[PDB]
């Protein structure tokens, strides 16, 4: 047939006929305006199509042009600094070509420009007759000041090289490589295409074992995360990772985001900068965005995740470390519930499709550290941070999969304590993997992490009993434990996100602060315990009277600015306070 | 170009059920098309195609299906989707929920015809809103501040004074001084006293030449509610993005809109969401709420203030629940404050404005505004916890510090929240009423505030 | 004259209400006032006194006409009204008159056909609008509106419709809201320029 006809329409769902050769998840083009849709059910010579665009004004007997391919994404030069639709339409090019604030229905623009010329350099070790395989790097494009864009043979492509282009400037339409296998030939340009629903293959997945630093002390200290991690969070961190992290490339997916909040990200990110080789550069040179505001079509909302993870697997394969942020996995699960309802399926719990946990697990299990395909030996990774927006089925399904979970506390948020993460329901399962990194690079931190979690849990039981008895019965060691728990909550776990001194707290600052607070806890508790069974007995009030300057210095340790002061000064200042503490306790 | 070809008229009606008429033998049916129905007595109704299949079309009828029959009633198919006429002459006019006049003036002589669904504005072309609207209400301007171009609902309930808060915002709104709004007002399912109150207030203020009203009262047909927000917002988009006005849009009960969707969805026998609402309720509401804000290279704007009656005061009900996942905040009207004759009854704890963080502060309003808002919030949160403890243990268990928080909680509700309906407070009066409460405490308790802000503003 | 019960009788203009409907209760008249043209609900569990408040308001209020509707409630609660109201008298011009001279009743007791409870409500409000148009101040009592909502649930159930909350049809809120909008104070149609009103006092049986 090559084109069917529309038989019926009801919202974003189209039924078409003479679709006899059609396959599950083929894309089609519907109507005289050629709207994209994806096939999702077959019955004889009829197909049901989920349309990615508004169907208003579509008529019975309209054409359905039957394309041969599944939903798939253009991969190659020109992804850095791009803004994309959930379906990979280029929002900055559509704006420029149409000269208008609107998006036209059925608009067609290639996701990567064929007009721009890219500087290409081949791998120089390759010559005609060389044997090559999927994932082999065969050239480099100088896309940007930060990013050397490796050009790779597509996965499932292979053979013997018949032509390889000289160093020069080329269009994304120009043939840079040709090869042969079983007498069949392929001609290849700098751009490949991949189905977003298919995992990009690798030689080997590897254990994740290096921290993914975030600017926030709660997350770095109590609930660590790793390069190649899977994390769920409440929906601060988005800017923080982007301007300050161990990651090479950032991908942000605004899946179901509010109009004026997506507009914040799209204005804000291109203004931000980082310092590279003693020179300052925009972070937009190593970032790509997928934008999908809450009013865009429900099927594009669903695809927006698969686009962003495929773009992340593409830079993983080059041997980069990639960080992906998904702005709500709950607003994505909202789309699955709607599409499942439009298809007359039986739900499971709370109206969600019974396959929701398979859909989530298939997304999150695309994270990891890997040994890439093809000939140059590499490692790369994708780290996924998924916002959750509530007990509920989406949270319950997510906790079966993710290795780290950070939960919100409404008591902290309503007391205007930030970041408002609950340190008693949160968890991280990476700590045994990371303890060899902490053993190699810090040695002291594992005891400090352990003791801080004990103090925070011990005080949570005392905080129940003092509601009954009004504090009066409490022993001095236990008052010491209340008051130091508060020091930790207000002067370590609390962190202002906007002030320059605490915009990003490096790990040498993080270990330094906590080392002093735990050293204080030991000496203050030892003074009380050593003067039990005695005529002179030390109390928290005696320590507070004797050591008010040490409490003022301890509470002030947060103010050290890592932009103004170096490692040596910040360590020396904290070490001088440790001596001031010891001298004060020796003076008691 | 035009639709110059004739319109087919069908007597082939085949079923009638609730708000729906079903036709067959329809030639090449078009989804979302408009249909005009002439009844056996010559009454004219209007409707829209909700589904097509082969020769069969399902029409929702806006004015209801009473008196329709399967033989004499005839449908004319217009060949097109719903386009409303628009013009700048719509300011100072009154229309029903279908957009027909009720002021005894003529019908709109168009400057254009616009599709009531609007057209998608590119996320690259939007501008992030940073001008603060001074609403004149301290519980908003001090702790839940509104940017010009925001979407921010009022969440309320039966018997509470949300209409007075809405009218007071319309009287008192302007920019902070170191323009004045065109108003588009929509009503779904309001009683006659509510419609009279708002119309009377805009006349009492002497400003009706700058406002457009679309009214669907509780005796008018419920399926007109499906289009009423979309007529209002299509008018606001012409006025804002073609005539360069600053528009404020008021949508006065989203709960009675959401019930009209549930009728149509129930009549179609669609698969339910929670509480029987449509499975697509989020995606539908989002088409109304995301029609707001600012665009690059055009001087106008739209600010949106929806209003919700929450059933049983349940904020987790699907109507207020889904509205929070789309709009940039909420203002919450509280029965416990209303029962004590506080006005506004705004509870500052569940209230939020997500765009305030960048609209306030140095150069915008005053350099303390961020710190004072955080500290006033933390004091009220602690004071409400002390109040809840005190009722178990009696005042003999409370410390002198617990009495400082319990004193603050009274002085805050008596002076900062309580205001009265025609009092208008600047941001500056709002902040300096705020500092008179923060002085209840010694400096050492004000933990949210940095020493520079304490040093500059506490001694006064 | 003959009128369709489902269609609102026209008026020149609805007016703000400006005068109390005195019930003769100390509570109600002091703490929670009502007006000529007002809308009231009386929710409460069995035995709370909804019908006794309805009967007391019917006997002693400052209204020119009473229309009393008993859809889906007891036959003895109708029989009590028929027994009492001929004996009880108001005073006119120094002469006493039975209050049954100002009263009409619409009965459809809890064992009469379920579908007729809808017709009772629309009959009683149409009768109330007819005397409003003469320039009278009328009160309508509807001694349980839950019995009407519960009748809609069976008819809707046998029509095999999809339910909203707790089995009720999705149109229930529109059926209630358009009934209560028939209350008010008005300038009547026509030219002798009179004014009249209907107050509605709907009991609810949760």
């Amino acid at each position: 047939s090559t084109f069917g006809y529309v038989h019926g329409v009801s919202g974003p769902v189209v039924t078409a006929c003479d679709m006899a050769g059609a396959a599950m998840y083929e894309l089609v083009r519907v109507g005289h305006s050629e709207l994209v849709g994806e096939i999702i059910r077959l019955e004889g010579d009829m197909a049901t199509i989920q349309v990615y665009e508004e169907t208003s004004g579509v008529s019975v007997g309209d054409p359905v042009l039957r394309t041969g391919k599944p939903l798939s994404v253009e991969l190659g030069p020109g992804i850095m600094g791009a803004i994309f639709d959930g379906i990979q339409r280029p929002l900055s090019d559509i704006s420029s070509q149409t000269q208008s604030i609107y998006i036209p229905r059925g608009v067609n623009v290639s996701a990567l420009s064929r007009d721009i010329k890219w500087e290409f350099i081949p791998s120089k070790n390759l010559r005609v007759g060389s044997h090559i395989t999927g994932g082999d790097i065969y050239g480099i494009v100088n896309e940007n000041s930060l990013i050397k864009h490796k050009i790779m043979l597509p996965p499932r492509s292979r053979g013997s090289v018949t032509y390889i282009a000289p160093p020069g400037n080329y269009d994304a339409s120009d043939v840079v490589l040709e090869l042969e296998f079983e007498g069949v030939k392929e001609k290849l340009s700098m751009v490949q295409v991949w189905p977003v629903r298919q995992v990009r293959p690798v030689t080997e997945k590897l254990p994740a074992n290096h921290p993914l630093l975030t600017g926030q002390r709660v997350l770095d200290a109590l609930f660590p995360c790793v390069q190649g991690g899977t994390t769920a969070i409440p929906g601060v961190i988005s800017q923080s990772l982007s301007k300050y992290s161990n990651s090479d490339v950032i991908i942000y997916v605004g899946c179901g985001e509010r109009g004026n909040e997506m507009s914040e990200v799209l204005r804000d990110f291109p203004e931000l900068t980082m310092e590279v080789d003693g020179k300052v550069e925009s972070i937009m040179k190593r970032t790509a965005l997928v934008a999908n505001t809450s009013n865009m079509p429900v099927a594009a909302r669903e695809a927006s995740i698969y686009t962003g993870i495929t773009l992340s697997e593409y830079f993983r394969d080059m041997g980069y470390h990639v960080s992906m942020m998904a702005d709500s996995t709950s607003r994505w699960a909202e789309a699955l519930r709607e599409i499942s309802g439009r298809l007359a399926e039986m739900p499971a719990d709370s109206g969600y499709p019974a396959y929701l946990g398979a859909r989530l697990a298939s997304f999150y299990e695309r994270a990891g550290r890997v040994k890439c395909l093809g000939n140059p030996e590499r490692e790369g990774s994708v780290s996924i941070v998924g916002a959750v927006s509530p007990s509920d089925p989406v949270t319950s399904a997510t906790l079966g999969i993710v290795q780290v979970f950070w939960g919100l506390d409404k008591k902290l948020a309503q007391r205007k304590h930030f970041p408002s993460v609950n340190w008693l329901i949160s968890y991280s399962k990476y700590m045994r993997a990371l303890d060899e990194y902490y053993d190699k690079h810090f040695t002291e931190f594992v005891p400090l992490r352990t003791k801080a979690k004990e103090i925070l849990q011990e005080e949570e039981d005392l905080a129940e009993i003092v509601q009954l008895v009004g504090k009066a019965s409490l022993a001095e060691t236990d008052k010491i434990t209340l008051e130091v728990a508060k020091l930790i909550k207000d002067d370590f776990l609390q962190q202002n996100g906007y002030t320059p001194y605490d915009r990003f707290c490096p790990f040498y600052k993080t270990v330094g602060m906590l080392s002093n607070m735990i050293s204080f806890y030991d000496m203050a508790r030892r003074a009380v315990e050593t003067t039990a069974q005695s005529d002179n007995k030390i109390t928290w009030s005696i320590i507070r009277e004797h050591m008010g300057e040490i409490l003022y210095k301890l509470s002030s340790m947060k103010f050290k600015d890592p932009v103004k002061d170096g490692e040596a000064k910040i360590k020396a200042d904290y070490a001088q306070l440790l001596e001031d503490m010891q001298n004060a306790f020796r003076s008691l | 170009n035009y639709l110059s070809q004739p319109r087919l008229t069908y007597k082939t009606v085949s079923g009638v059920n609730g708000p729906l008429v079903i036709l067959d033998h329809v030639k090449f049916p078009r989804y979302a098309e408009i249909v005009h129905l002439t009844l056996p007595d010559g009454t004219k109704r209007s409707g829209q195609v909700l589904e097509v299949s082969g020769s069969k079309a399902v029409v929702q009828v806006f004015e209801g299906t009473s008196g329709i029959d399967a033989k004499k009633t005839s449908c004319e198919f217009t060949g097109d989707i719903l386009r409303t006429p628009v013009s700048e002459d719509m300011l100072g006019r009154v229309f029903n929920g279908s957009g027909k006049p009720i002021d005894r003036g003529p019908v709109v002589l168009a400057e254009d015809f616009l599709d009531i669904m609007g057209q998608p504005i590119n996320p690259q072309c939007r501008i992030y809103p940073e001008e603060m609207i001074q609403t004149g209400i301290s519980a908003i301007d001090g702790m839940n501040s509104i940017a010009r171009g925001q979407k921010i609902p009022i969440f309320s309930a039966a018997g509470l004074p949300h209409n007075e808060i809405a009218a007071q915002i319309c009287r008192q709104a302007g920019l902070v001084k170191k323009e004045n709004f065109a108003i588009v007002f929509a009503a779904m399912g309001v009683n006659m006293e509510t419609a009279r109150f708002f119309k009377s207030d805009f006349e009492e203020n002497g400003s009706m030449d700058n406002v457009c009203l679309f009214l669907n009262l509780a005796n008018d047909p419920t399926i007109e509610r499906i289009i009423t927000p979309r007529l209002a917002l299509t008018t606001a988009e012409f006025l804002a993005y073609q005539c360069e006005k600053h528009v404020l849009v008021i949508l006065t009960d989203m709960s009675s809109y959401a019930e009209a969707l549930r009728e149509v969805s129930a009549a179609r026998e669609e698969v339910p969401g929670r509480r029987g609402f449509p499975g697509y309720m989020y995606t539908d509401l989002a088409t109304i709420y995301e029609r707001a804000g600012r665009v690059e290279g055009r001087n106008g704007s739209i600010t949106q203030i929806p209003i919700l009656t929450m059933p049983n005061d349940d904020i987790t009900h699907p109507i207020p629940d889904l509205t929070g996942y789309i709009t940039e905040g909420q203002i919450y009207v509280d029965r416990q404050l209303h029962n004590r004759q506080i006005y506004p009854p705004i509870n500052v704890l569940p209230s939020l404005s997500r765009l305030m963080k960048s609209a306030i502060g140095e150069g915008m309003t005053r350099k303390d505004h961020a710190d004072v808002s955080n500290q006033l919030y933390a004091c009220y949160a602690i004071g409400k916890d002390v109040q809840a403890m005190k009722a178990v243990v009696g005042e003999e268990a409370l410390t002198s510090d617990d009495l400082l928080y319990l004193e603050f909680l009274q002085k805050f509700e008596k002076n900062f929240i309580t205001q009265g309906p025609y009092e208008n407070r600047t941001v500056y009066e709002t902040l300096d009423i705020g500092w008179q409460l923060l002085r209840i405490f010694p400096k050492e308790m004000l933990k949210r505030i940095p020493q520079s802000t304490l040093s500059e503003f506490y001694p006064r | 004259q003959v009128w369709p019960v489902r269609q609102v009788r026209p008026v020149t203009e609805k007016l703000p209400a400006n005068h109390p409907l005195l019930t003769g209760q100390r509570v109600l008249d002091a703490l929670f006032p009502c007006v000529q043209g007002g809308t009231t609900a009386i929710p409460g569990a069995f035995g709370c006194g909804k019908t006794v408040i309805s009967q007391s308001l019917s006997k002693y209020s400052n209204s020119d006409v009473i229309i009393y509707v008993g859809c889906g409630e007891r036959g003895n609660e109708m029989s009590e009204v028929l027994r009492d109201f001929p004996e009880l008298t108001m005073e006119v011009d120094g002469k006493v008159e039975s209050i049954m001279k100002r009263t009409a009743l619409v009965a459809n007791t809890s064992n009469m056909p379920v579908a007729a409870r809808e017709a009772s409500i629309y009959t009683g409000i149409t009768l109330s609008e007819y005397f409003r148009d003469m320039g009278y101040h009328v009160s309508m009592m509807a001694d349980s509106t839950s019995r009407w909502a519960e009748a809609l649930r069976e008819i809707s159930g046998r029509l095999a419709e999809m339910p909203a909350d707790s089995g009720y049809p999705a149109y229930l809120g529109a059926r209630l809201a358009s009934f209560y909008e028939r209350a008010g104070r008005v300038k009547c149609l026509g030219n002798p320029e009179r004014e009249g009103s209907v107050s509605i006092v709907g009991a609810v049986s949760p």
């Binding site: 007359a344 039986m346 | 026998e269 | 095999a160 999809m162 339910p163």
Partner: peptide, 25 residues
Amino acid sequence: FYRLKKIQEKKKIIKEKSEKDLERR
């Protein structure tokens, strides 16, 4: 539960009327 039944019944009736139309083809 009462709404997940009834939706099954309406689907069953549609499948029966569909099959009983194929008996006319």
